[PDB]
């Protein structure tokens, strides 16, 4: 008994905001229906790209109108971007026919498409961007320059540490001449004192953005999408893992219940360890050897990791599915967490290794991996007398920075470099090799 409707794209199908003259646009039209003559049309929902609504009106001829400014707003939200790029909008109208008794009968109709291009954004300032706010002092001399990210050239960053929350604005370099700031040239938020921490940048009578946080923060500015975030930039200085295999952390402080990870050198909130996991072991991590601000399964885990180790979520615990030795890599800055499981590749480096310093992190310099939960990684026998160096190298760390995660043996213990400088040299002789028990924390050269 089912009714159909046919919609078509309205006459304003290709909107260029720079050029747009009207304050309302026609975006769609009901062209025909199999509903009887005399029926009224009611609109149960009008959505854009599936989950966005917008105020709308419908004319006597069943043309659907919206305010251009709100269509433009909704388009920029949908795409999280003010970029001046042609954006597709898919319009879904769910309508009903209404009889003289008031009964609504559902129309099954199609979707239609239009596009809209947001207005031209400011030019990128060749000399970059500055932050000025309560925390700096509102003047040219106090303005702090944002760092242009090496990987993404649209992205500018400032890390700061502040005593209380702060209002601030972003200025292009050309707005600032000596101590003088041209206030008319601010970039900021739509609302003065916006405390969302994550919103659009405005270039038109911009208000001040509020940090919403204090302490260590990071202010990010995307000068292509024109968006900003302000994020908690503090990080744990230590990190510990407990587990089903460790009595779930009882008692507190016990090196028996809590395993320290090793800080990555000079690298905020990032840690690593080499650990044995059985199948179905569950673990969680904490910033001390005890429960509190602990975490387990999180969202930023590689598909790689998940495949390599068979990882899954088990009531918020992290569950390891495939037994084995793994290099565990963990990063925590403010709220953002990353956990990676990787091959436990330990490498001989330097003078006692293959072609010396000249081939680094190569297959020959790889330590054999034990099958047991208490065996020993063993290096390739030394090719020469020289100083022994040993490392891992996580994906996230460049090969040049192998020394950020290096260690050695002193007095039959594994001594991690961690955040410290070069370790005291330890000599080996030709045909010797290293033995590591990561379960014990002990080792030998022999
Ligand atoms: O919650 C704490 C305070 O909140 C409010 O203070 C904020 C703002 O909300 C925030 O935007 C930002 O302010 C920045 C501006 O963003 C930045 O652009 C720059 O401001 C310059 C203006 O842009 C220029 O237009 C020019 O301003 C003129 C202004 O147009 C004139 O009207 C005149 O401003 C007078 C006011 O008229 C007076 O009423 C008086 O305002 C006092 C209030 O009386 C106080 O209650 C208090 O209010 C604060 C909120 O405004 C809260 O404490 O302080 C204001 C003054 O800040 O005095 C002002 C100034 O004498 O003269 C202005 C020129 O002097 O030039 C200004 C640059 O001076 O800098 C602003 C910061 O200084 O940050 C704040 C503070 O966190
Ligand atoms: O035999 C006892 C139980 O064994 C298993 O429970 C484990 C959990 O699976 C582990 O996750 C862990 O629980 C921690 C928890 O992870 C940690 O957050 C903290 O819990 C806080 C919680 O964050 C807070 O919101 C509030 O509710 O207080 C909680 C503390 O009570 O501490 C937990 C440990 O106390 O360890 C337990 C074992 O103790 C198994 O899943 C259970 O069904 C079983 O009963
Ligand atoms: Na080598």
Residue of 240, 237, 235, 218 lying closest to 295 (CA atoms): 240
Number of domains forming the structure of the chain: 4
Residue 312 and residue 331 in one domain = yes
Pairing mode of beta strands 14-16, 112-117: parallel
Locate 168 and state its tokens. Answer: 């601030």
DSSP assignment of 5-64, as one string?
A: EEEEE-S--EEEGGG---SEEEEEEEEEESSPTT-EEEEEEEEETTTEE---EE-TT-EE
Enumerate long-range contacts of 180-183, CB under 8 Å, 24 or more apart. 180/140, 181/132, 181/138, 181/139, 181/140, 181/143
Is the Cβ atom of 291 under 6 angstroms away from ligand 2? yes
Residues 304 and 368 in one domain: no
Provide the 3-class DSSP secondary structure of residue 306.
helix
The residue to which tokens 């500055």 are assigned? 130
- Residue ending a domain, among 298, 320, 344, is 344
- Does the annotation list 7 as a binding residue? no
440 and 358 in one domain? yes
Residues 110 and 172 in one domain: no
Q: Which atom of ligand 2 is nearest to the CA of 314?
A: 9
Task: Tell me: do 276 and 335 sit in the same domain.
Answer: yes
Block residue for tokens 């601010």: 186
Q: Which residue's CA is the closest to the ligand 2 atom numbered 24?
A: 292
d(CA 395, CA 392): 10
Distance CA 390, CA 410 (A): 13
Residue-wise burial string across 145-166, b where 16 or more C-beta atoms lie within 10 A, e elsewhere: ebeeeeeeeebbebebebeebb
Contact 167/133 with Cβ under 8 angstroms? yes
Can you give the residue range of the structural domain that contains 254?
235-344
| Sign of CA pseudo-dihedral 301, 221, 263, 347 | positive
Please report the atom of ligand 2 found closest to the CA of residue 296: 16
CB of 377 within 8 A of CB of 346? yes
Point out the ligand 1 atom lying closest to the alpha carbon of residue 193.
9
8 Å CB contact between 263 and 418: yes
- Residue 259 assigned as binding residue: no
Q: Does 284 contact ligand 2 (Cβ within 6 A)?
A: yes
Is 407 found in the same domain as 294?
no
Question: 62: phi > 0 → left, psi -120 to 50 → alpha, else beta; which?
Answer: left
Token pair listed for 368: 């054999």
Experimental method: X-ray
321 and 377 part of one domain: no
Regarding whether 112 and 126 lie in a shared domain, the answer is no
Helices and strands, counts by H and E, the chain: 2, 38
DSSP letter at 175 equals G
How far is the centre of ligand 2, averaged over its atoms, from the C-alpha of 313 (Å)?
15
- Cα 203 to middle of ligand 1, angstroms: 18
Return the residue matching tokens 């503090």: 234
Q: What is the CATH number for 402?
A: 2.60.40.3610
Q: How many residues appear in the chain?
A: 446
In this structure, are strands 147-148 and 104-108 parallel, antiparallel, or unpaired?
unpaired
Does residue 151 come out as left (phi exceeding 0), alpha (psi in the -120 to 50 range) or beta? alpha
Domain boundary among 206, 234, 262: 234
Closest CA to ligand 2's atom 22: 292
Residue 134 alpha carbon to ligand 1 centre in Å: 11
291, 293, 313, 317, best to mutate for ligand 2 pocket (most atoms within 8 Å of CB): 291
- Whether 33 and 69 map to the same domain: the answer is yes
Q: How many CA atoms lie within 13 A of 238 on its CB side?
A: 9
Q: Which atom of ligand 2 is nearest to the CA of 282?
A: 9
d(CA 26, CA 68): 9
268 labelled as ligand-binding? Answer: no
Co-location of 33 and 139 in the same domain: no
3 state DSSP class of 141:
helix
- Cross-strand pairs, 201: none
Name the DSSP class of 357. Answer: G
CA distances from 96 to 9, 27, 105 (A): 19, 19, 5
292: left (phi over 0), alpha (psi -120 to 50) or beta: left
Reported as type and span, the H/E element at residue 162 is strand 155-162
Q: Ligand 1 centroid vs 158 CA: distance in angstroms?
A: 24
Domain termination residue (choose one: 344, 367, 383): 344
CA of 204 to the centre of ligand 1 (A): 17
Q: What is the DSSP letter of 194?
A: B
- In angstroms, what is the span from residue 420 Cα to ligand 3's centroid? 23
155 and 208 inside one domain: yes
The rounded distance, in Å, linking the Cα atoms of 63 and 27 is: 8
- Partnered with residue 339 across adjacent β-strands are 330
Please tell me the distance between residue 139's alpha carbon and the centre of ligand 1 in angstroms: 13
- What's 197's domain CATH number? 2.60.40.3620
Helical residues (DSSP H) of 165-246, grouped into ranges: none
Tokens of 147: 């760092």
134 annotated ligand binder: yes
Range 142-147, long-range pairs (CB < 8 A, 24+ positions): 143/171, 143/176, 143/181, 146/170, 146/219, 146/221
306 in Cβ contact with 318 (< 8 Å): no
Q: Are 27 and 71 in contact (CB under 8 A)?
A: yes
Cβ proximity of 267 and 393 under 8 Å: no
Dihedral angle sign, alpha carbons of residues 100, 102, 103, 107: positive
303 and 339 share one domain: yes
Burial category of 39 from C-beta neighbours within 10 Å (exposed 0-12, middle 13-18, buried 19 and up): middle
Ligand 1 interacting residues, C-beta cut-off 6 A: 134, 138, 167, 169, 183, 186, 192-193, 207-208
Provide DSSP, 370-422: -SSTT--EEPPPPSSSEEEEEE---TTS-GGGGGGGEEEEETTEEEE-TTS-P
Question: Which conformational region is residue 316 in: left (phi greater than 0), alpha (psi within -120 to 50 degrees), or beta?
Answer: left
The atom number, within ligand 1, closest to the CA of 184 reads: 23
**CA-based nearest residue to 216, from 232, 238, 196:** 232
Question: Best substitution site from 240, 243, 244, 248 to test ligand 2's pocket, by max atoms within 8 Å of Cβ?
Answer: 248
């Amino acid at each position: 008994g089912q009714l159909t409707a046919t919609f078509t794209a309205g006459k304003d199908a290709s909107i260029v905001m720079d050029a747009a003259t009207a304050d309302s646009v026609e975006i769609a039209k009901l062209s025909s229906t199999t509903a009887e003559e005399g029926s009224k049309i009611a609109v149960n929902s009008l959505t854009l790209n599936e989950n966005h609504t917008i105020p709308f009106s419908m004319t006597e001829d069943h043309v659907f109108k919206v305010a251009l400014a709100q269509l433009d707003s909704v388009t920029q939200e949908a795409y999280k971007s003010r970029a001046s790029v042609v954006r597709e909008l898919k319009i879904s109208i769910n309508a009903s026919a209404v009889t003289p008794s008031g009964e609504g009968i559902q129309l099954v109709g199609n979707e239609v498409s239009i596009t809209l291009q947001p207005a031209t954004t400011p030019a990128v300032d060749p000399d970059g961007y500055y932050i000025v706010g309560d925390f700096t002092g509102w003047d040219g001399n106090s303005a702090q320059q944002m760092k242009k990210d090496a990987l993404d050239e649209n992205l500018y960053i400032l890390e700061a540490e502040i005593e209380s929350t702060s209002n601030f604005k972003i200025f292009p370099a050309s707005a600032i001449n000596g101590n003088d700031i041209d206030w008319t040239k601010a970039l900021g938020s739509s609302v003065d004192g916006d405390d969302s921490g994550d919103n659009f940048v405005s270039w038109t009578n911009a208000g001040a953005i509020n940090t919403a946080l204090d302490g260590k923060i990071k202010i990010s500015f995307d000068a292509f999408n024109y968006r900003f975030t302000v994020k908690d930039n503090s990080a744990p200085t230590e990190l510990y893992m407990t587990g089903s295999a460790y009595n779930w952390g009882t008692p507190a402080g016990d090196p028996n219940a809590w395993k320290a990870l090793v800080p990555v050198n000079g690298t905020k909130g990032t840690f690593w360890g080499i650990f044995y996991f059985a199948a179905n072991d569950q673990v969680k991590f904490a910033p001390q050897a005890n429960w509190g601000n602990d975490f387990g399964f999180v969202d930023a885990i590689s598909q790689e990791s998940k495949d390599l180790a068979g990882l899954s979520d088990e009531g918020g615990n992290l569950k390891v599915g495939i037994a084995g030795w793994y290099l565990v890599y963990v990063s925590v800055i403010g709220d953002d967490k990353v956990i990676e499981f990787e091959k436990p590749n330990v490498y001989l480096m330097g003078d006692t290794s293959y072609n010396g310093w000249d081939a680094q992190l190569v297959e020959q310099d790889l330590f054999t991996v034990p099958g047991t939960a208490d065996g020993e990684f063993v290096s390739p026998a030394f090719l020469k007398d020289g100083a022994v160096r040993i490392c891992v190298n996580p994906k996230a760390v460049s090969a040049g920075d192998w020394w950020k995660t290096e260690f050695i043996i002193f007095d039959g213990q594994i001594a991690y470099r961690g955040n410290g400088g070069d370790q005291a040299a330890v000599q080996g002789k030709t045909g010797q090799k290293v033995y590591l028990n990561f379960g014990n924390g002990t080792g030998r050269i022999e």
